[PDB]
Design a binder for this molecule. Structure first.
Ligand SMILES: Nc1ncnc2c1ncn2[C@@H]1O[C@H](COP(=O)(O)OP(=O)(O)OP(O)(O)=S)[C@@H](O)[C@H]1O
Length: 324
């Protein structure tokens, strides 16, 4: 067909009808300019925030964070918690592994004292407690630690494919409530793997499958390199790839530093995105910003930004006017 213009029209229209019956994120162009909702939960790392597209985590949606052990998931999660908490929101933490360390989550900014924690007896119980806790339209963010620990009441006593089904049913029922309250739920998913080929890789089937689909955003978190600090190791450089995102164009990635015992270095994210946005200038060893200097080396800069809270906000701000 010698078509050309009218093509874009029927296409535009097509999209419209699809979006109309399946959702506003059903189809997208990897380049489309991202949408912007009113409420969103910062992840605590400008970098990942503007990789998610909407500048944080979507509300009333099921988010999945998977990856190896010690990649970062929990931290990322606890931050999504501490943030939603700062704005006077209430969070709950369904525990199925018993590996939380308040003292750490405290340093992250989580008001642990008023943090609702539950330690279910069975798998179904976890999801159901999570359900009514969700339906009270009282929770802002709810986090279920470790999918693979939600063992079915059955297995916990007396066949086959029980976890995957338990999840299916749970997610079906729970999916509705969430969207009805704006409560966003984070599912931490371990992988227990990292012995294939020469590096890392993706998968699911633990109870996954269900999640993989119901989930509106799926983050692949993995550890890139163990941050050298002259001494031993301040933290690690985490790399997160959102492979699913029914809210903004998917497949965008981000990297950031997580200091041992400290968590996600906000400052550190400011600098990096800072330079990759022309706002911060790097004059060989030196890190300059709008004229006056910051420091010699990323660390001396982090530090400078970390104690000059007043100027850091200035930088986080502009990057936000420069994209939002
Ligand atoms: N209680 C803690 N004390 C000190 N450092 C911690 C603590 N919890 C996490 N970290 C650091 O945070 C990084 C990983 O975050 P994790 O909470 O282990 O998340 P994952 O989501 O990485 O978790 P498993 O899967 O490793 S619990 C590591 O580089 C740790 O050094």
């Amino acid at each position: 067909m010698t078509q050309t213009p009218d093509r874009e029209k029927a296409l535009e229209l097509a999209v419209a009808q699809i979006e109309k019956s399946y959702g506003k994120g059903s189809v997208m162009r990897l380049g489309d300019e991202a949408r912007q909702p009113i409420s969103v939960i910062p992840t605590g790392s400008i970098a990942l925030d503007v990789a998610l597209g909407i500048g944080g985590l979507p509300r009333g949606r099921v988010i999945e964070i998977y990856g190896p052990e010690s990649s970062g998931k929990t931290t990322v999660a606890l931050h999504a918690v501490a943030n939603a908490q700062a704005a006077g929101g209430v969070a709950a933490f369904i525990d199925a592994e018993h590996a939380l360390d308040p003292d750490y989550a405290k340093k992250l900014g989580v008001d642990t004292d008023s943090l609702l924690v539950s330690q279910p007896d069975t798998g179904e119980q976890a999801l159901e407690i999570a359900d009514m806790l969700i339906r009270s339209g009282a929770l802002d963010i709810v986090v279920i630690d470790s999918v693979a620990a939600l063992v079915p009441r059955a297995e916990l006593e007396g066949h086959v494919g029980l976890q995957a089904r338990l999840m299916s049913q749970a997610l079906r029922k729970m999916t509705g409530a969430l969207n009805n309250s704006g409560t966003t739920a984070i599912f931490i998913n371990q992988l227990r793997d990292k012995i294939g080929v020469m590096f890392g890789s993706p998968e699911t089937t633990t109870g996954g499958k269900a999640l993989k689909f119901y989930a509106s955003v799926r983050m692949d978190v993995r550890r890139v390199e163990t941050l050298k600090d002259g001494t031993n190791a301040v933290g690690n450089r985490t790399r997160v790839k959102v492979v699913k995102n029914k809210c903004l164009a998917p497949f965008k990635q981000a990297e950031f530093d997580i200091l041992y015992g400290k968590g996600i270095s906000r400052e550190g994210s400011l600098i990096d995105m800072g330079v990759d946005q022309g706002l911060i200038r790097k004059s060989g060893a030196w890190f300059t910003y709008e004229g006056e200097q910051l420091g010699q080396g990323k660390e001396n800069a982090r530090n400078f930004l970390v104690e000059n809270a007043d100027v850091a906000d200035e930088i986080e701000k502009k990057i936000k006017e420069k994209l939002g």
